Design a protein around this ligand. Sequence first.
Ligand SMILES: NC(=O)C1=CN([C@@H]2O[C@H](COP(=O)(O)OP(=O)(O)OC[C@H]3O[C@@H](n4cnc5c(N)ncnc54)[C@H](OP(=O)(O)O)[C@@H]3O)[C@@H](O)[C@H]2O)C=CC1
Ligand code: SF4
Ligand code: SF4
Ligand SMILES: [Zn+2]
Lengths: 114, 176, 126, 96, 370, 95, 111, 208, 287, 48
Amino acid sequence: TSVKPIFSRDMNEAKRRVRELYRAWYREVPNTVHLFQLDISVKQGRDKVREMFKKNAHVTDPRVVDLLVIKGKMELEETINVWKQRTHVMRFFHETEAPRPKDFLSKFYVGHDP
Amino acid sequence: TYKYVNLREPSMDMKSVTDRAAQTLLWTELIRGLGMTLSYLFREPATINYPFEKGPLSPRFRGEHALRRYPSGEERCIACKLCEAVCPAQAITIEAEPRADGSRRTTRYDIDMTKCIYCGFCQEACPVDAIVEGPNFEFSTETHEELLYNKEKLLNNGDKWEAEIAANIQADYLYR
Amino acid sequence: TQLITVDEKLDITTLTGVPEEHIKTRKARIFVPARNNMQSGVNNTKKWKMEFDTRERWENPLMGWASTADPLSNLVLTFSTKEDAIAFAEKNGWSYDVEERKVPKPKSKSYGANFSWNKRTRVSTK
Amino acid sequence: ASATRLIQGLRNWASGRDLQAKLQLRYQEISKRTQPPPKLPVGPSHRLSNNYYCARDGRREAMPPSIVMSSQSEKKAVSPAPPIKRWELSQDEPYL
Amino acid sequence: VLRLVMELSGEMVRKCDPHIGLLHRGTEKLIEYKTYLQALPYFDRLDYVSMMCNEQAYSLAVEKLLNIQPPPRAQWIRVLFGEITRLLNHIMAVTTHALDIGAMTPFFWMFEEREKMFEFYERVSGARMHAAYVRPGGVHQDLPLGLMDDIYEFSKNFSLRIDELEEMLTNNRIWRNRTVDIGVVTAEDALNYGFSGVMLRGSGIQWDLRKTQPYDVYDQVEFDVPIGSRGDCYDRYLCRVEEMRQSIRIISQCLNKMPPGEIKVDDAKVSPPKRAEMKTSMESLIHHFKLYTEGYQVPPGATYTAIEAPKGEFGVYLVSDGSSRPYRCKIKAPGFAHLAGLDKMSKGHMLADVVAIIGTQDIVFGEVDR
Amino acid sequence: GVRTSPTGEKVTHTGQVYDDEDYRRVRFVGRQKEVNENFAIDLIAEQPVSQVGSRVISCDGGGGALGHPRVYINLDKETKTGTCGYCGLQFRQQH
Amino acid sequence: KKTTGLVGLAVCETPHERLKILYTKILDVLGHIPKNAAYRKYTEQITNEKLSIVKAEPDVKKLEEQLQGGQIEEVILQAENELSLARKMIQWKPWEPLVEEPPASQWKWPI
Amino acid sequence: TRPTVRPRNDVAHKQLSAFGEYVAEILPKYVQQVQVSCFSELEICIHPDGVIPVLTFLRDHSNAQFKSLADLTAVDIPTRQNRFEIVYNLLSLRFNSRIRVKTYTDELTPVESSVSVYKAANWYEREIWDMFGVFFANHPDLRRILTDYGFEGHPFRKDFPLSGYVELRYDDEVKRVVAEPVELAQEFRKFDLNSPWEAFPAYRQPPE
Amino acid sequence: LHHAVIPHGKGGRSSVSGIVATVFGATGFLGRYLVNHLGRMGSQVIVPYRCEPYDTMHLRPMGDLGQIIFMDWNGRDKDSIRRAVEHSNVVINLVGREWETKNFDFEDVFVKIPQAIAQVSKEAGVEKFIHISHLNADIKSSSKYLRNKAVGEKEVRETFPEATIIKPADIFGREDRFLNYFANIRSLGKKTVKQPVYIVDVTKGIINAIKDPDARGKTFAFVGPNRYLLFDLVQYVFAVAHRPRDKVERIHTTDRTLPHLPGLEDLGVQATPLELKAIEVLRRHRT
Amino acid sequence: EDNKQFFGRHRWVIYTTEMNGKNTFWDVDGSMVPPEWHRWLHCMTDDP
Ligand SMILES: NC(=O)C1=CN([C@@H]2O[C@H](COP(=O)(O)OP(=O)(O)OC[C@H]3O[C@@H](n4cnc5c(N)ncnc54)[C@H](OP(=O)(O)O)[C@@H]3O)[C@@H](O)[C@H]2O)C=CC1
Ligand code: SF4
Ligand code: SF4
Ligand SMILES: [Zn+2]
């Protein structure tokens, strides 16, 4: 079984590149929320950024981690330019409900969603 | 075989070079262009007075999506679903039932005017020429609700005229 | 060029972008599609269709149509073997129900047995 | 058209192309409509007594693709095709 | 309609990212969920200015896979409408280049001529622009009596009008100043960046798909494709106008070389029959019925072909299960291939020259999407 | 030739007329429910039942290659008229 | 010559000896390449054929009409790119036997 | 058989057969299939390691020039472990011939980014990365071009359905355009057109 | 009840939700946002207008295909109003100009309009009728506005007694009146304590109360989260905006809470503060 | 219908006042022609 990985040797370089990518996203947020004339506090945006990071913490396969790093770098480039507009940046957020909780009885009233 | 362009040289003879200098310093072929455009000025322009004169067409235009019916008879459609089987944006919607008589017929025959690309495939696919692309093209509808035809709208639109449709088909039932 | 490679599993569901509601809630089914019984021809066999289970389809209150909030409702994936079907379903994340293939059973019939003498297999009509 | 001669001369002086002759306003050679009804021909089939569909079965002439080397002193190194001959300037007024 | 993010040193450039994909529609996926005969109009309208050569390429793809040759009258009529489509796409590319560069009026002159050509499409089929009309299996529902003389009339009047277009422009001094120095293309660039058709005509190498691999009866008409010398945009303009004039030649020889064979193939299991046998047969009614419900089965395999769209190499790559549905279609687009080298075509110019570069390679921005 | 339901509007040639508890009646406010006022079943009794002296006879539809395809119908039902599934017009036998 | 039909390519004045030193460098870099493969055989055969075309002809236009690759300087550029593949194919060992196989149920089409 | 059925040339078939046999003999390290169809267009089927060496050979060598680069796509075939098929298409300026370099690849392991020798492959590789996810190591810039920015899913796969998962609408609540889960107005009906009865007897695969 | 009034599936874009709402007004501010949130819910809205169809045209495409419907009404006849409320699940009453006109006072819109519509409603058989009112509209002085609203409050309370009489405080938003007057200044300085409530929490509360039964009969009042001085709020407005008689009396008149009636907490909606939405809405200053 | 104009100005309609009753002296719509004149006026024929 021969598999050629992207960048990784163990998860140490994975941790290193993802913490540098998070540093880049931290210094990415205030410039963009000032540039696009947005309407959201910096605390909420940074907490949703780190929540999106903490969503996919369950991955140990290093090639998948490499491909996540490359995708995040792509969208950090495309938001550090002015290539993406106000619509996509708000589309990362969810301010328009979408109210659906995970209760059993709530899904039993508005039914057929098991 | 090839016939290419731009293979010459500016002629070093005195007459040709002073003619190019005369065009350079005397604005000549610009005024030649003005003369050609004034020649098109003194023509009569080819316009049509739109609400009174309508532009020419063919006997095989594809317009209104009208229906036909039998001579002093019932509805020409059978609901054989060929038009919905061929409809390349699936705008036809047929739900069929037989009535109390016994001949097979419909319940719901809907054309979406949004999705209708106006091919002609439902005309060519109809074995009995039930649906016919109509002659007139004036829909111009102020509301989006009104652009979803029902079968009764199609029957009224096929009973506002057949004589146009019958004349066009009776002229050109031999090509197709 | 003879790099890291480790013999493990695959986790493409964090990449293919379909949301986790549709990941963990919807369920797949892998089956050979049965012969449509009115015809008798089994060219519609030899393939392993992967489908998703059906969900709600209400009435469109202006035209009488069946709208749905199901983008995945009209997927089908015709495959060639059960192994690659299960491998792809486990590769892309969601759950799956395996139904097994059923060939027509071979029989033993003959026209002379339809013209028996003291056996009850008799055509009785022709 | 349908205009007097002085402005016609001014059109032909501003553009010496004989504009009165062909002006892109069609008058005479509009195709006279309501033509006689045509009888179409039927081509090299409906020919009785010989049209076996077994012969002209171009759907069933689809061979599977032949295979050379796989996963399971030679006079060679030819090209996939003969090399393409360079064209010629066409005589019908080339440049130059 | 495009997005362009250019990064420029002042009244000049440095780089430019063409963000394209605005006009994405999912055409390959929709053809993968349909049949052949039903999904032919997607091929008709992925490109839209050229409109019958796309029909021609898809029909020849299916006929080449299906090993069925159309009757010869169908081939010559297909050649005639391919020349109409060639003439139409080149004249619209010239006029939209003129309108985007300035030059208000010749746009409208040549669009009046194109209004005559849409009247011809109407008299042929009925549609204004997106006439399908080219079934795989030859042309369907042939021309009404009284069309070829109208095409003859258009050929005479349009030779006169295109000579008057070269009277107006072409030795226009400041239009020559506007587009001569821009748009240089090396032959190595024309190979590596994968250019197609008119760019290859304009920059160096003598190359015609029509002449090298005659996919139809183009081999039996005398015409000569114009070539470029300096690899240049004014030179490419002259190449387009002389390809129009060659299309006038091919129309004249096609009208003089017309055989009266038949409309469609005499293989009713591929092309549907006509109305008389349809209303009194049995085999033809069955063939009509099942041919329009299911679609004819197509033997498995992957084919590719490519014809000369007025942009360039219009390629189509079919992948077929033994089925009435294609398993995977894909389209090689000359607009995409021409847009692919925009940085190296516009490394050393300014923004109005970039708009002239977008003009001088004929664009529709629908076909660039695939 | 239409019924008037207690809702109060025009009925059609399909049994689809509304209930009183509907909102689609009130979205019909201001614009008339246009319907074909020339129904289908009533144009069957208007057609005379033809009587042909043969036994197994033809139906085309009034025009070669204009209509529905050929169908040959039987008249063995002694009291029941032959009925084309396409046409809808009847036939009888006269020995 | 005088202003050939190509664009980014001006005419050369000594085509013959330049082309000959090009093909002798082709023979040298082919002499670097090992023996037992037939790649050396096909390259050596076609290069000796083309060199035998050029050595027997001091002409120009007859040399174009005989030796393919019209008109002239494309042969020189193509010789440069042939030297480029020669330099790149000292390395990369194209003549050595195969790397491992596909799973063998892949290149059969009709699925 | 002769009218209305396209005749062929066995001469071009023999030429492409001999040429493909030649290429298969002189690059043995990566050649797996050299197949020739009925109408003489060559296909060479290649392991995903000899991408750069085979393309550097096929750009040059004065026996197969093939400067012209065309399509790149990786035809999504399931029932395999190596799913995607990277299809290079090459056209010869000098010889007028078409070869299809089909190299095979899986979901996650990169092939070696042909933009190093092919300057036309840049936006082709960016397109394949956007629509599929075939990663390209040693590439200058990989971005999302021909998709929306905030959209993800790699939609030209077979796992991505016809309709998208998201659907935009404007709303005056937050005074802007937002995305929602898809609420179709109609079904996109599905016609079971795969008829039985074996329309091609020659392409029968052996059953079990 | 008949089918196609029951909910169906998920929400949004012609998913058949519960209520069919006849709305009076909706060309103004709060009714437009309320039609917006019912279109997000996916509810059919029957709205009559009286003005040019251009206003209902630029608020037309809020719904999906043919969901909302437009008709005519007038402040004089019961026939057009009754025709508008022939078949309705719920009905809401929002009306009022904040200056007297030639043909209408503060009297008889707030008085005469709920009389006839409540008459044809109670003869019609509608349910969950929601009538808005300004907060602290008393019998007391200083406003024909507030006293005619108090008379209308007593009318809607007396006839058809199980109406949800609802009142927010003075709401601010994208098209506020009093923050616009804070922008359209010049000045004068007074004192009044005041709580502002943002508009989207108000209309979310209204749609939640109208879709949630068993919460009927009780009058509701909406509460601003800050409740401080007016002049400090004016200083806050000028600070965030970078620059240094009936409406001004009706903002200086009265702003209090009432411990009698229930508010936000019996509905379960998060309150958005003044500061966040005020920073969001205070655009259109110098650069 | 006049002959001396070009193809596009042969056949022109002159609408009248209140054929349906909507004061169509001014504001003349399209499709106010019967369908046989909709065949004639759109240049689909050469005979009235
Ligand atoms: N801070 C605030 O503004 C608060 C307001 N309210 C109340 O909320 C309601 C809505 O406020 P708002 O949107 O700002 O004001 P609007 O004037 O815009 O709303 C009233 C609506 O009814 C219509 N209308 C009013 N009078 C007449 C009339 N005589 N004839 C016909 N139509 C009439 C209006 O115009 P049109 O006719 O063109 O449709 C509009 O559509 C008001 O009743 C107000 O008292 C309550 C609490 C706080
Ligand atoms: S094809 Fe014709 S007869 Fe058949 S269902 Fe359609 S309209 Fe009716
Ligand atoms: S013309 Fe319209 S209704 Fe007919 S098949 Fe085409 S899209 Fe469907
Ligand atoms: Zn009949």
